[PDB]
Amino acid sequence: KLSAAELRQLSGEELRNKVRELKEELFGLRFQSATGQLENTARLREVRKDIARVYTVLQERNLNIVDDP
Amino acid sequence: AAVCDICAKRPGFGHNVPWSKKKTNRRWSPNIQRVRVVENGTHKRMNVCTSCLKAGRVSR
Amino acid sequence: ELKIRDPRDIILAPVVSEKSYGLLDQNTYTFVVKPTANKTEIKIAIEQIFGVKVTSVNTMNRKGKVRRTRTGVGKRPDTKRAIVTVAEGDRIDIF
Amino acid sequence: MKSLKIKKGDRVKVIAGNDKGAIGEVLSVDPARERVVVEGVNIRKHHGIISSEAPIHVSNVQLVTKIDGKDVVTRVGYRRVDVTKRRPDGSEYAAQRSVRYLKKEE
RNA sequence: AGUUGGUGAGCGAGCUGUGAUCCGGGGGUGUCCGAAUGGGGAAACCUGGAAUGUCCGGAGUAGUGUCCGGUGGCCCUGCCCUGAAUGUAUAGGGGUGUGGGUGGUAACGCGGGGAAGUGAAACAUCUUAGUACCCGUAGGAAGAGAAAACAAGUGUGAUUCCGUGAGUAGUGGCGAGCGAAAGCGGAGGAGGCUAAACCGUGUGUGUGUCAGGUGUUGCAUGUGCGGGGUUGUGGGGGCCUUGUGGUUCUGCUGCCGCAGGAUUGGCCAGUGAGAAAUGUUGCGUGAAGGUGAAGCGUCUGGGAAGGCGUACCGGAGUGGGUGAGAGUCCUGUAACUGUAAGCGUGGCACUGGUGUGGGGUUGCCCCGAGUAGCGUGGGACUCGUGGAAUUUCGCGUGAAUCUGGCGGGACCACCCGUCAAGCCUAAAUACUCCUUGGUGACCGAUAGUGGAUGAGUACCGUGAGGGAAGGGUGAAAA
RNA sequence: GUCCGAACCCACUUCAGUUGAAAAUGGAGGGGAUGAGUUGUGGAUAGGGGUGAAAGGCCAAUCAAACACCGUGAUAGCUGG
RNA sequence: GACUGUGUGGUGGAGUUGAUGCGAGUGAGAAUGCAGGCAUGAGUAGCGUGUGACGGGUGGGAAUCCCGUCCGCCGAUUAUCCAAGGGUUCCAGGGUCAAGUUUGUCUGCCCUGGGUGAGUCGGGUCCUAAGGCGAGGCCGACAGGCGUAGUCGAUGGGUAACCAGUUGAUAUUCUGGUACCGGCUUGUCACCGCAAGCUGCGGAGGGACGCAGUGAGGUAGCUCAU
Ligand SMILES: [Mg+2]
Ligand SMILES: [Mg+2]
Ligand SMILES: [Mg+2]
Ligand SMILES: [Mg+2]
Ligand SMILES: [Mg+2]
Ligand SMILES: [Mg+2]
Ligand SMILES: [Mg+2]
Ligand SMILES: [Mg+2]
Ligand SMILES: [Mg+2]
Ligand SMILES: [Mg+2]
Ligand SMILES: [Mg+2]
Ligand SMILES: [Mg+2]
Ligand SMILES: [Mg+2]
Ligand SMILES: [Mg+2]
Ligand SMILES: [Mg+2]
Ligand SMILES: [Mg+2]
Ligand SMILES: [Mg+2]
Ligand SMILES: [Mg+2]
Ligand SMILES: [Mg+2]
Ligand SMILES: [Mg+2]
Ligand SMILES: [Mg+2]
Ligand SMILES: [Mg+2]
Ligand SMILES: [Mg+2]
Ligand SMILES: [Mg+2]
Ligand SMILES: [Mg+2]
Ligand SMILES: [Mg+2]
Ligand SMILES: [Mg+2]
Ligand SMILES: [Mg+2]
Ligand SMILES: [Mg+2]
Ligand SMILES: [Mg+2]
Ligand SMILES: [Mg+2]
Ligand SMILES: [Mg+2]
Ligand SMILES: [Mg+2]
Ligand SMILES: [Mg+2]
Ligand SMILES: [Mg+2]
Ligand SMILES: [Mg+2]
Ligand SMILES: [Mg+2]
Ligand SMILES: [Mg+2]
Ligand SMILES: [Mg+2]
Ligand SMILES: [Mg+2]
Ligand SMILES: [Mg+2]
Ligand SMILES: [Mg+2]
Ligand SMILES: [Mg+2]
Ligand SMILES: [Mg+2]
Ligand SMILES: [Mg+2]
Ligand SMILES: [Mg+2]
Ligand SMILES: [Mg+2]
Ligand SMILES: [Mg+2]
Ligand SMILES: [Mg+2]
Ligand SMILES: [Mg+2]
Ligand SMILES: [Mg+2]
Ligand SMILES: [Mg+2]
Ligand SMILES: [Mg+2]
Ligand SMILES: [Mg+2]
Ligand SMILES: [Mg+2]
Ligand SMILES: [Mg+2]
Ligand SMILES: [Mg+2]
Ligand SMILES: [Mg+2]
Ligand SMILES: [Mg+2]
Ligand SMILES: [Mg+2]
Ligand SMILES: [Mg+2]
Ligand SMILES: [Mg+2]
Ligand SMILES: [Mg+2]
Ligand SMILES: [Mg+2]
Ligand SMILES: [Mg+2]
Ligand SMILES: [Mg+2]
Ligand SMILES: [Mg+2]
Ligand SMILES: [Zn+2]
């Protein structure tokens, strides 16, 4: 569970690196789910919620909802 | 035509009333004439009524 | 612009079955892909993700099965499957 | 929607049912359907099958207190107190909260 | 303090109290179709940018296939350039996105088109009925609305709506039927602008005007913009007897006077229809919440809310749950209370924004024109063509203008009322797709919605369209 | 727009079927079978209208005016309850 | 009299009795009434052209499933492959409530899982016919009608691949071999140059077309063979 408060302290480039890392983790989780692995099925949804959190932070910086560092 | 491009005069609707008063639906159309007009230097045709022709509301 | 696009958005899951396992003997991998992705997009995405030279990408559309249950007719989703033929020795580790 | 006046871990006395007069710790609460599981009260079956407690209505139990050597059942009230609530970012601010007190013990 | 919607549980989580789920408010994302809008199309699909460094920006490749984002639908409109045949010009053409539009919507509104079955014991006038339906077009309501009115001799005084008048007066193959108005009782309760006369202001152009002054000194017409004006026992303009709120002092007319001018009154007047529209302070609330009184013992029962006994609360005994019938077990209820927030909303104060007339005179000047009337063919009015007023559409014809026009049921005269051919106006009235709370000598699964469940579903039909049936274990799945 | 004759198109006779195998067919024969032929695919004409080598024929299995919905709970001096 | 007991059981498991008023969706035997359930005909008619027999297996159960051997049947089609239309019915396993006009261990049925691979095949990305729509526009009280420039629209024109092999289920698609077409890029040769080329825009040629008929030269196929 990422926190939007922490992500709001990160800068844009590290936030996008976080987006890409989360996408890669979701890819790996889906492959494990397909192949019979993945005991931890909650992380499969939590990584997508984390992607949503990072997108919310990035877009609120883009739309000036919160000041962009 | 039956609609004047000036003043927007349109047909009226009423009755044929014969000797026996057996009413039938009929129309009264305005006396629309198609005339050449030159307005603001533009030459064109206009369907205008004779009432706007008599009033001088159209520039020929 | 928001919403970074990733190659991993296009390759959803591998297909694991007897036909797929028999295809793996000839360096051929079956994936479920986004239904709107073409062969060239899939080829480039597979090369980006797996670091492998791809000799071919074939595609098919598999209609979803229809079953009558209580609450009536239920319909499983339609999927697109990409069959990726890989260079002589490159290999893909799907786990 | 809000919660019930009986929470998990409370010591209650059953005031209705087969086990009227029994006293037990509330093991789990079901706020939606207004039913609670009380320790050692409604012993039935589940599902080589586990025999365990069953849920009774939350209105069939009453919180219990020891006044003069006996367990007596009481109702509850709420009093508002000043507290410091913390936002997700960590910031603190003054606010109010309700603390439950037992009647019959002031 | 539990939580990851339901039909319909356990995994793996998160809240592990760093307060989640949840509730209100505001945001972000929002595939494809659909007015659907880059182009095409069998809706939810396809396909794109001539040649060029590529439509523009970015990503990726050696490069091309590729990916992400943007832009460009059409119509009206504004602004700029050019102006055909051809001369003025215009049509058209080329740039810019300046603004608006497109489509949907259950009822109610306004304008227009408009049946038939039916009744008349047949049927054609008539009725049904201006109904059904259709077309155009709104708004939160719409329409109407400030007397070219009623009345009848005194009077009322915009409109709308309700009740009476009254199924009367009438009207009607005087058949079937249709059917007022004045007056009176109420709901509601505003009145406001403008055209024109006259005054300041360019182009189809000047040979006449004591500081001044020139073949014009500001002289001639008819646009636009400002003042003024807005009424009917006529009003206004003009001509004068006068009066503006205290002015720093600039022009023109006669070194009278009139007007732009200014922080500072102000009787006034304001976000309104009112010839108009811009901030900070002042209350209580709906959307969430908060507090919210007071019962135990015995008996029978599976179970107590029931019996018996004895206590409490009540500004709370309306309900509904709980294992049977509860004021005191739960949910609540009465009462108070909070409301951060709203686009919040209403209203007040200030800021800021805009701004007077009274008496006299008729010389003169203005007072809405293809309009009103008239004829003709139709329509609405109680009135079905008549003695036909009033009102309206098509076609002709066609005024007066205050010593004038219109109305008072043909018409004329007098009298009374009124001032058309310009505009805007709240409330009282209509309705309910919706949201919130409540109610019922309403239904209770063949009922009540077609629909208590996968219900506009299954099913039937090419299609428009038609269109069901199926509820109940138990207190607890035990 | 020859002749005989399959496919193909049709439908003259007869038998069966008639609660059928079939809301129009089957068996046996029969007519046309290079033509005014037949057939696939798409398209056009719509209800007082279409189309018709013409039978009031056909227009989605009952057409002297289709079907659907609406006026509408049409009306019935008639039958039934 | 419509009816009824405050008699007495049984079943049942949450309401309801009497007096007096108040209001009715207040009483059914019939409408070729409407809905449901169930009889009568009746264990009756039918079981939809036909040729099956036996041996073994499976199984609780076999005329009706599987395997085999005889025999019979279609063969211008009872074969093989497509279009339209259907939509997972295909394959494998498990099943025998329902469906199958009987039985069924079986199935086009049920449940679970799997299965369809294209530069060249059929469509689009190309082109137009009939026809549709249609910027402006013209016509029309409104609604709408027609139509230019265009844009769609195959049933037609154009367009590059064949043989063999492989699965339980796919195969001009996958695999092997051997080709072809269009791009991008690259080594190399040759040539241009008011005056290279590329793209647009058109002209022309071409595409490009009826019906019937005979003969010739071939080839596929088929037959026979020492
Ligand atoms: Mg004349
Ligand atoms: Mg393919
Ligand atoms: Mg919070
Ligand atoms: Mg609380
Ligand atoms: Mg589009
Ligand atoms: Mg379109
Ligand atoms: Mg280009
Ligand atoms: Mg009529
Ligand atoms: Mg009639
Ligand atoms: Mg009659
Ligand atoms: Mg009659
Ligand atoms: Mg509105
Ligand atoms: Mg109005
Ligand atoms: Mg009155
Ligand atoms: Mg003016
Ligand atoms: Mg309480
Ligand atoms: Mg008791
Ligand atoms: Mg009349
Ligand atoms: Mg008249
Ligand atoms: Mg008159
Ligand atoms: Mg009179
Ligand atoms: Mg006037
Ligand atoms: Mg008005
Ligand atoms: Mg209301
Ligand atoms: Mg029923
Ligand atoms: Mg029902
Ligand atoms: Mg019942
Ligand atoms: Mg259908
Ligand atoms: Mg012949
Ligand atoms: Mg012959
Ligand atoms: Mg025939
Ligand atoms: Mg058609
Ligand atoms: Mg005849
Ligand atoms: Mg027919
Ligand atoms: Mg008939
Ligand atoms: Mg008729
Ligand atoms: Mg009627
Ligand atoms: Mg009674
Ligand atoms: Mg009845
Ligand atoms: Mg009966
Ligand atoms: Mg009966
Ligand atoms: Mg029987
Ligand atoms: Mg027998
Ligand atoms: Mg018999
Ligand atoms: Mg017999
Ligand atoms: Mg028999
Ligand atoms: Mg056999
Ligand atoms: Mg044979
Ligand atoms: Mg298919
Ligand atoms: Mg299946
Ligand atoms: Mg099936
Ligand atoms: Mg099968
Ligand atoms: Mg099987
Ligand atoms: Mg059977
Ligand atoms: Mg089987
Ligand atoms: Mg064409
Ligand atoms: Mg047009
Ligand atoms: Mg095309
Ligand atoms: Mg074709
Ligand atoms: Mg096969
Ligand atoms: Mg092959
Ligand atoms: Mg190959
Ligand atoms: Mg050519
Ligand atoms: Mg040519
Ligand atoms: Mg030719
Ligand atoms: Mg030969
Ligand atoms: Mg041989
Ligand atoms: Zn006119």
**Coil vs helix vs strand at C49:** helix
Evaluate whether D20 touches D30 at the Cβ level (below 8 Å).
no
Q: Which two tokens stand for residue B57?
A: 């509301």
CA nearest neighbour of D74 among D50, D35, D106: D106
- Return the residue matching tokens 């890669």: A24
Kind and range of the H or E element at C13?
strand C11-14
- Return the residue matching tokens 């190659």: C7
The DSSP-derived string for chain D is: ----S--TT-EEEE-SSTTTT-EEEEEEEETTTTEEEETTTSEEE-----EEE-EEEGGGEEEEEESSSSEEE--EEEEEEEEEEE-TTS-EEEEEEEEEEETT--
**Residue C69 CB neighbour total at 10 angstroms:** 7
**Coil vs helix vs strand at C39:** helix
Question: Long-range contacts: D27-35, Cβ < 8 Å, 24+?
Answer: D27/D53, D28/D55, D29/D4, D29/D58, D30/D55, D31/D1, D31/D3, D31/D4, D34/D4, D34/D58, D34/D59
d(CA C25, CA A13): 42
d(CA D37, CA D61): 10
Neighbours of chain A (3+ CB pairs under 8 A): C, D
Q: Which two tokens stand for residue A58?
A: 């990035």
Phi-psi region of B41 (alpha: psi -120 to 50; beta: other; left: phi over 0): left
List, in order, residues 6 or more apart from B32 with CB less than 8 Å away: B1, B2, B3, B4, B47, B48, B49
Return the HEC string of B2-60: CCCCCCCCCCEEEEECCCCCCCEEEEECCCEEEEEEEECCEEEEEEEEHHHHHCCCCCC
**Domain total of chain B:** 1
For the CA of C17 and the C1' of G21, the distance in angstroms is 84
Resolution to 1 decimal, in Å?
Answer: 2.5
**Residue B19 CB neighbour total at 10 angstroms:** 5
Least CA distance to A12: which residue of chain C?
C2
Evaluate whether D39 touches D19 at the Cβ level (below 8 Å).
no
Query: C-alpha dihedral over D14, D20, D24, D29, to 10 degrees?
Result: -40
Q: Which two tokens stand for residue C5?
A: 């696009």
Note which residues in 15-44 of chain C have CB less than 8 A from chain A. Answer: 15-16, 32
Query: What is the domain range of residue D27?
Result: 1-106
Evaluate whether C35 touches C80 at the Cβ level (below 8 Å).
yes
Burial D67-95 (b: 16+ CB within 10 A, else e): eeeeeebbeeeeeeeeeeeeeeeeeeeee
* Contact exists between B and C (3 or more beta carbon pairs < 8 Å): no
List, in order, residues 6 or more apart from C67 with CB less than 8 Å away: C73, C74, C76
Burial (CB count <10 Å: 0-12, 13-18, 19+), residue D66: exposed
Least CA distance to A61: which residue of chain C?
C2
**Residue C13 CB neighbour total at 10 angstroms:** 18
Burial (CB count <10 Å: 0-12, 13-18, 19+), residue D47: exposed
A68 lies within 8 A of chain C by CB = no
Query: What is the domain range of residue B41?
Result: 1-60
**Coil vs helix vs strand at C84:** strand
d(CA C84, CA C31): 8
* Contact exists between A and C (3 or more beta carbon pairs < 8 Å): yes
CA nearest neighbour of D73 among D60, D84, D64, D81: D64
List, in order, residues 6 or more apart from D74 with CB less than 8 Å away: D62, D63, D64, D65, D102, D103, D104, D105
CA nearest neighbour of C15 among C62, C76, C54: C62
List, in order, residues 6 or more apart from D94 with CB less than 8 Å away: D82, D83, D84, D85
d(CA C14, CA A33): 10
> D63 - beta bridge partners?
D12
Residue C2: list chain A partners with CB under 8 A.
55, 58-59, 62
Closest partner CB to A31 (pick from C4, C9, C13):
C13
Q: Amino acid identity of B7?
A: C
DSSP state of C16: -
Return the HEC string of A3-67: CHHHHCCCCHHHHHHHHHHHHHHHHHHHHHHHHCCCCCCHHHHHHHHHHHHHHHHHHHHHCCCCC
